[PDB]
Amino acid sequence: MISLIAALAVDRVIGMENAMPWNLPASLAWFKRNTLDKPVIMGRHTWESIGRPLPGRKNIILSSQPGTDDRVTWVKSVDEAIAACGDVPEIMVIGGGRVYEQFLPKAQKLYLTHIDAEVEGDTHFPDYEPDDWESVSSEFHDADAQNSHSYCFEILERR
Amino acid sequence: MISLIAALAVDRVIGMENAMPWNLPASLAWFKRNTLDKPVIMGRHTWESIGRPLPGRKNIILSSQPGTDDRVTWVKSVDEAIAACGDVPEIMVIGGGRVYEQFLPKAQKLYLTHIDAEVEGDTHFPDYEPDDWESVSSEFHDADAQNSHSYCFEILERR
Ligand SMILES: CN(Cc1cnc2nc(N)nc(N)c2n1)c1ccc(C(=O)N[C@@H](CCC(=O)O)C(=O)O)cc1
Ligand SMILES: CN(Cc1cnc2nc(N)nc(N)c2n1)c1ccc(C(=O)N[C@@H](CCC(=O)O)C(=O)O)cc1
Ligand SMILES: [Ca+2]
Ligand SMILES: [Cl-]
Ligand SMILES: [Cl-]
């Protein structure tokens, strides 16, 4: 089963190349809890933003360019990315924009962090029609001394 | 000698009701570089924001109320805070507003990270006379895969 996991600001803006303007450790912990022990597929920009292989996860990079690093798996296509994950119960797609566009058709679950921040951006998370998706769980949290903005975790299942 | 180290957004903002809306690992690395192996004096609210004692530094908290963590030294006056530093060459004051207000008149140097972020702040760095300080180093960086805003590191010496 293929799942997409993303953090969206107002209007579905998502990061593209530069780091996003927020500091949300509670949300990164949620990202960790939900991707640990599973394979993660991401594009080149995400991988440069992360800065190293996420531990406890099989790191798969989907890019047209070559593999700088040997601690992860470099693949040139969707089928190849899918294949490198082997047979597992759940494959996590962690972005960015293009990658999400490529897997959305095949996705069965969406884990999203909705963040109350207005950010000017080019890239948007794909339009997903919530009538094609059932929201199953939602949990809001206010900003605090450690989290810059209010955020809401949402899980949706494809119907 | 006492030095002040601060991160200022536009208009000298240094704090907000919640965590600052930025992700700047390169500035944190500069802050560690410049405070490592030194005593650091901070107020209670800055301590609470940090979450734990800073490693490799003697952490001193200036507060009127009693201490809640045995890992650090709690002090009730400027004089006590200084004294708790012992005999070292340089004492670093890490904020917040009021604490910077009480040490500025005794400071000979300032390490400032200026960040291009326009935000509404709650506290601000005390007003410094640009005719009383000499900029001895400056270094500009744009936002990147890991840093959400452009920033500039500056060190000033009291004329
Ligand atoms: C830039 N980036 C991609 C990123 C960040 N937050 C997201 N949040 C959501 N919900 N979804 C994503 N796809 C997402 N992707 C990052 C950056 C750092 C780490 C990271 O260091 N994670 C540690 C957790 C905290 C830590 O130890 O620093 C982990 O083990 O996953 C993860 C993703
Ligand atoms: C919120 N806060 C206060 C803070 C942040 N940046 C500043 N930056 C400057 N220039 N000056 C300050 N006084 C300042 N203070 C923090 C928060 C975290 C860490 C911290 O974890 N720094 C680690 C380095 C980064 C890391 O290990 O994650 C360290 O060892 O110093 C420091 C200060
Ligand atoms: Ca100069
Ligand atoms: Cl990407
Ligand atoms: Cl404080």
Curated annotation (Swiss-Prot), chains A, B:
Entry superkingdom: Bacteria
Keywords for this protein: Antibiotic resistance, Methotrexate resistance, NADP, One-carbon metabolism, Oxidoreductase, Trimethoprim resistance
GO molecular function, one term: dihydrofolic acid binding
Enzyme class name: oxidoreductase
Ranges in a coiled coil: none
Gene Ontology BP, a term: one-carbon metabolic process
Catalysed reactions, semicolon-separated: (6S)-5,6,7,8-tetrahydrofolate + NADP(+) = 7,8-dihydrofolate + NADPH + H(+)
Matches recorded under CDD domains: DHFR
Record-listed NADP(+) binding positions: 7, 13-19, 45-46, 63-64, 76, 95-102
Functional pathway: Cofactor biosynthesis; tetrahydrofolate biosynthesis; 5,6,7,8-tetrahydrofolate from 7,8-dihydrofolate: step 1/1
Ranges for domain DHFR: 1-158
PROSITE patterns: DHFR_1, DHFR_2
A GO cellular-component term linked to this record: cytosol
Keyword Transmembrane: no
Effect of M42Y: Increases catalytic rate almost 2-fold. Increases catalytic rate about 7-fold
Annotated binding of substrate, by residue: I5, S27, R52, R57, T113
Keyword rRNA-binding: no
Gene3D superfamilies per record: Dihydrofolate Reductase, subunit A
Enzyme Commission number(s) from the entry: 1.5.1.3
Miscellaneous section: The strain K12 sequence is shown. Strain B [RT500] is resistant to 500 micrograms per milliliter of trimethoprim.
Protein family (similarity comment): Belongs to the dihydrofolate reductase family.
Role description: Key enzyme in folate metabolism. Catalyzes an essential reaction for de novo glycine and purine synthesis, and for DNA precursor synthesis.
Record's protein name: Dihydrofolate reductase
Protein species of origin: Escherichia coli (strain K12)
